[PDB]
């Protein structure tokens, strides 16, 4: 979750283009970043993949 300066930031999944339910596997996919496969168990956003890093949410490899 992130909010910087908007009234409403509830895209904030990925304060971007997620409606938390089309995301990926924790973050906010709605293409093919860490939401089908490629690591995890799951698939490989940085995003989640960083996540992954220094919030360890996730445990696959970032990419
Ligand atoms: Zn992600």
Redesign the pocket.
Same mark, same amino acid.
């Given at each position: 979750m992130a909010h910087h300066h908007h009234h409403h930031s509830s895209g904030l999944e990925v304060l971007f283009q997620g409606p938390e339910g089309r995301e #990926?596997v924790? #973050?906010? &996919?709605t293409a093919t970043?860490?939401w089908r496969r490629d690591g995890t168990g799951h698939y490989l #956003?940085n &995003?989640?993949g960083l996540y992954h890093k220094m919030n360890g949410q996730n445990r696959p490899l970032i990419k």
């Open positions: #990926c924790n #973050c906010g &996919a970043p860490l #956003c &995003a989640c």
